[PDB]
Amino acid sequence: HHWGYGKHNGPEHWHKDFPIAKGERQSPVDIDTHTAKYDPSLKPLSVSYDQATSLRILNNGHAFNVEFDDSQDKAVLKGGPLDGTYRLIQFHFHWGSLDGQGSEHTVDKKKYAAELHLVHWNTKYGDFGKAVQQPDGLAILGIFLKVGSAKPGLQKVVDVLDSIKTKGKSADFTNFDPRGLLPESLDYWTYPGSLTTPPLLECVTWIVLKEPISVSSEQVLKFRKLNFNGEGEPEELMVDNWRPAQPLKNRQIKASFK
C-alpha cells in the first residue's frame, strides 16, 4: 500500500507515512501575485546548461525522470536567491488528465496543464542524498506548461515515452539539451519549500518562472499514455500525478520582477 495519487493512497493520505506532510514549509503553494513582494536584493538567475550531459530516462511509477551526469559541474543553476552552485540531477513533469489541471504550483489559483521541475542539488553537500537533509540542499526550477503551440525542444522526450510505458522501464537518453525547455524570460517567484513527493523533505529553494512554455495537445496527450503500473499489471494511466497547493504558513513569496 505505497503512496501514490489514487483515492486510497493519494496526497491526503501521505501524512500517515510522512508526518512532515503537515509541516511548516511544504510545497507546492498557490502564488498570490498581488501579495508577492518584489525583492531588489535578488540577483539575476544564472542557468548554465551548455555542457549538460543527459544519460537516461526512467519511468519510476510516479513520473518520468530525465537523468543527468551530476558528477561534475556541467549543468548548473546559480544566482537569484541562491548562494553557491547547484547541479542538475534530473527533470520531470507533473500533469493532468485534462488540460485544466496538472500543475502543482498555482498562480492566483489558476492551474496549468502541467509543470516541469528541473531538480538541482547544492554542491557544498557532496551528493544528492546528503543535500536533501539540508534546508538549503536543493534548488528546483519550476516551469508551467500550457496547451497551445508545440514545444520543439520537448519532442525528443515525447517520442521516447513509448519505450518506458511502465514502472521500472528505462531507456538511453543522451545528448538531450534542456535549454530547449526554457521560456524566453527568467522572471521568477521564489520561496522556501519542500519536495512535492514523499519523503516531502523541507530542503528546497523553489524558483518558479512567471512565463509558461506552450506545448501541443498532441504532446501532452502522449504524457497521458504512460502507466503508473508495471508491465503485466492492470493498466492505470499516469495522469494527475500532482500534489495540490499546501498552506503558505509563515512564508513570503518574493518576486524578481515588478
CB 46 within 8 A of CB 73: no
Rounded to a whole number of angstroms, the minimum distance from the CB of residue 82 to Zn ion is: 18
In the region spanning residues 60 to 79, those forming contacts with Zn ion, defined by CB under 5 A, are none
Rounded to a whole number of angstroms, the minimum distance from the CB of residue 258 to Zn ion is: 28
Asked whether position 243 contacts Zn ion by CB under 5 A, the answer is no
Q: Are strands 86-95 and 76-79 parallel, antiparallel or unpaired?
A: antiparallel
Query: Nearest residue to Zn ion, using CB?
Result: 117
In the annotated binding site for substrate, the residues are 196-197
CA 226 to chain centre: 17
> Which grid cell is 180?
530547449
Nearer to Zn ion, 39 or 199 (CB): 199
62 labelled catalytic: yes
3-state helix, strand, coil in the chain (%, to 5): 15, 30, 55
- Helices (DSSP H) in the chain: which residue ranges? 128-131, 155-160, 217-223
From 87, 117, 167, 210, residue interacting with Zn ion (rule: CB under 5 A): 117
Q: Residues 190-209: x/- map of binding to Zn ion (CB under 5 A)?
A: --------------------
Residue 172 pairs with which residues in a beta bridge? 56
Nearer to Zn ion, 36 or 138 (CB): 138
Nearer to Zn ion, 117 or 222 (CB): 117
From 2, 13, 62, 105, active-site residue: 62
Sign of CA dihedral 207, 209, 80, 251: negative
Stretch that binds Zn ion, among 80-88, 110-118, 143-151, 201-209 (CB under 5 A): 110-118
Question: In Å, how far are 4, 96, 139 from 247, measured between CA atoms?
Answer: 21, 21, 20
Stretch that binds Zn ion, among 13-21, 111-119, 218-226, 243-251 (CB under 5 A): 111-119
In the complex, which residues of this chain contact Zn ion (CB under 5 A)?
Answer: 117
